[PDB]
Enzyme design. Sequence first.
Site, PDB file in Angstrom:
ATOM      1  N   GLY A   1       0.650  -1.268  -0.060  1.00 52.32           N
ATOM      2  CA  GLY A   1      -0.089  -0.138   0.038  1.00 52.32           C
ATOM      3  C   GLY A   1       0.917   1.377  -0.084  1.00 52.32           C
ATOM      4  O   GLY A   1       0.470   2.334   0.708  1.00 52.32           O
TER       5      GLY A   1
ATOM      6  N   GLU B   1       3.068   3.389 -13.192  1.00 55.67           N
ATOM      7  CA  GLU B   1       2.465   2.014 -13.381  1.00 55.67           C
ATOM      8  C   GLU B   1       1.095   2.310 -13.928  1.00 55.67           C
ATOM      9  O   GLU B   1       0.785   1.807 -15.080  1.00 55.67           O
ATOM     10  CB  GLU B   1       2.617   1.477 -12.089  1.00 55.67           C
ATOM     11  CG  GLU B   1       1.897  -0.050 -12.195  1.00 55.67           C
ATOM     12  CD  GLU B   1       1.709  -0.797 -10.727  1.00 55.67           C
ATOM     13  OE1 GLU B   1       0.813  -0.194  -9.951  1.00 55.67           O
ATOM     14  OE2 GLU B   1       2.151  -1.689 -10.581  1.00 55.67           O
TER      15      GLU B   1
ATOM     16  N   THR C   1       1.334   3.141  -2.744  1.00 62.23           N
ATOM     17  CA  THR C   1       0.680   4.106  -3.656  1.00 62.23           C
ATOM     18  C   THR C   1      -0.543   4.629  -2.727  1.00 62.23           C
ATOM     19  O   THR C   1      -0.431   5.982  -2.576  1.00 62.23           O
ATOM     20  CB  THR C   1       0.074   3.469  -4.700  1.00 62.23           C
ATOM     21  OG1 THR C   1       1.210   3.052  -5.592  1.00 62.23           O
ATOM     22  CG2 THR C   1      -0.879   4.609  -5.731  1.00 62.23           C
TER      23      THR C   1
ATOM     24  N   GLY D   1      21.278  -0.849  -4.460  1.00 57.82           N
ATOM     25  CA  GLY D   1      22.523   0.075  -4.676  1.00 57.82           C
ATOM     26  C   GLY D   1      22.527   1.313  -3.556  1.00 57.82           C
ATOM     27  O   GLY D   1      22.027   1.146  -2.575  1.00 57.82           O
TER      28      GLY D   1
ATOM     29  N   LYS E   1      15.283   5.914   8.655  1.00 58.04           N
ATOM     30  CA  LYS E   1      16.425   6.790   8.602  1.00 58.04           C
ATOM     31  C   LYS E   1      15.749   8.258   8.457  1.00 58.04           C
ATOM     32  O   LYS E   1      14.982   8.448   7.634  1.00 58.04           O
ATOM     33  CB  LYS E   1      17.347   6.679   7.389  1.00 58.04           C
ATOM     34  CG  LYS E   1      18.255   7.824   7.091  1.00 58.04           C
ATOM     35  CD  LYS E   1      19.108   7.714   6.014  1.00 58.04           C
ATOM     36  CE  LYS E   1      20.068   8.773   5.583  1.00 58.04           C
ATOM     37  NZ  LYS E   1      21.119   8.477   4.595  1.00 58.04           N
ATOM     38  N   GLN E   2      16.198   9.251   9.285  1.00 57.79           N
ATOM     39  CA  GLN E   2      15.554  10.713   9.241  1.00 57.79           C
ATOM     40  C   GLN E   2      16.861  11.522   9.837  1.00 57.79           C
ATOM     41  O   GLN E   2      17.621  11.100  10.342  1.00 57.79           O
ATOM     42  CB  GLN E   2      14.256  10.786   9.713  1.00 57.79           C
ATOM     43  CG  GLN E   2      14.364  10.612  11.277  1.00 57.79           C
ATOM     44  CD  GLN E   2      13.285  11.201  12.070  1.00 57.79           C
ATOM     45  OE1 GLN E   2      12.916  12.464  11.588  1.00 57.79           O
ATOM     46  NE2 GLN E   2      12.660  10.763  13.081  1.00 57.79           N
TER      47      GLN E   2
ATOM     48  N   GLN F   1      10.258  -0.570  -4.475  1.00 62.25           N
ATOM     49  CA  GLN F   1       9.769  -2.008  -4.152  1.00 62.25           C
ATOM     50  C   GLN F   1      10.898  -2.629  -3.577  1.00 62.25           C
ATOM     51  O   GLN F   1      12.194  -2.447  -3.693  1.00 62.25           O
ATOM     52  CB  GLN F   1       9.513  -2.565  -5.705  1.00 62.25           C
ATOM     53  CG  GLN F   1       8.323  -2.107  -6.323  1.00 62.25           C
ATOM     54  CD  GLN F   1       6.972  -2.172  -5.935  1.00 62.25           C
ATOM     55  OE1 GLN F   1       6.786  -2.821  -4.864  1.00 62.25           O
ATOM     56  NE2 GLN F   1       6.160  -1.326  -6.642  1.00 62.25           N
TER      57      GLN F   1
END
Length: 419
Positions: A198, A224, A200, A362, A396-397, A340
């Site tokens: 979920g 998409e 999107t 990556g 992470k923030q 994803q």
Amino acid sequence: IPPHSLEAEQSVLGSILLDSDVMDEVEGLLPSPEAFYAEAHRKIYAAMQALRSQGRPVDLVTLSEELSRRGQLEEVGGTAYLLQLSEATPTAAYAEHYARIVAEKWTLRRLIQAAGEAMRLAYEEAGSLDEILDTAGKKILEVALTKTDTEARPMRELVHETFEHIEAVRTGFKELDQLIGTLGPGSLNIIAARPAMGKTAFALTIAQNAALKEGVGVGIYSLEMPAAQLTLRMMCSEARIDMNRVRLGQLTDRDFSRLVDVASRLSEAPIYIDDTPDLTLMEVRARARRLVSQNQVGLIIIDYLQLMSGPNRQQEIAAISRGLKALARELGIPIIALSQLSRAVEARPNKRPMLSDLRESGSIEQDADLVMFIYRDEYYNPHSEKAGIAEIIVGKQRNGPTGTVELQFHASHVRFNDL
């Protein structure tokens, strides 16, 4: 034959000599000496700033002292030119006015140069068409988005602007916003989860909260699904209608007007959706600039990363995320990129994501300012009691600590609500 106003430049310098307190005002509109067209005035101004940079009163006496030190006292026209600047203006009360003139004439010169830069890049033909158009657009867009050309900005200028701002985009989820604050200008924000989790739905909620509630323009790169469908989903979700089950001839006259009303509120939202299916990084950039300049836009959403093209699949994705980080910075707005995750995440007892999982796609973690995962217990446990609850794991923030925040998820019409 560049645009300038010698009279306005003189009035500015002259009115600073009459009253050095106007320097506050003038430096606001004219932060960098480069604004001055005349080589002479540019030297004068740079020295008047240094005199403030040393806190010593800016007047006819101290300026000569500072100039002749550097050596330009004669270049600038002697103390006689300095004298003339004083008398050539009767007041200091109009400082702002003349500065606005000088500031504006400079922008035109700044544009002339940027345009000429683009023109020179096209002639050269070094670099692919995408790279040429990318730089050409970046230069031009910089003229409107950056106040100066200065490589290293002075603290005084910076403090003035941050302070100006603190006298005066949020996710809309009250408890999440407490943990992470706003999605800052020039930041890459990543929402990563397994498919069907979920992302999107989640992203579109932010888009609605920002556009409908805060009133900020938001552009969506729906790679998409086609725009038409994304629109139907937002209407139907809001109006509590399962468009996948419920047919048209099966709508009650009531809940029909209901989605026309839901459709009314949505229609006024400044949300722009681009559904071109296979965009490269360069293309997203080129489009972003056109979008951002044609419309007030404070948020961009890329749905989703893995569908973007390259000009090694890890390395393409890492080059993309790097380019998006750059884009965010260039526009000074936050960008959300949805991502994803591999099946790898699921090949372990604790099936919820964590930062480490990202290094599989990556060096993307390095360029994301915020990283938020989405895990639902219903996904891997049809029974397991955490049904309506969905958990958002901030991996992470920079505004606070890591942490899992939980929200309500109703699978019915696919929505996210506060807990």
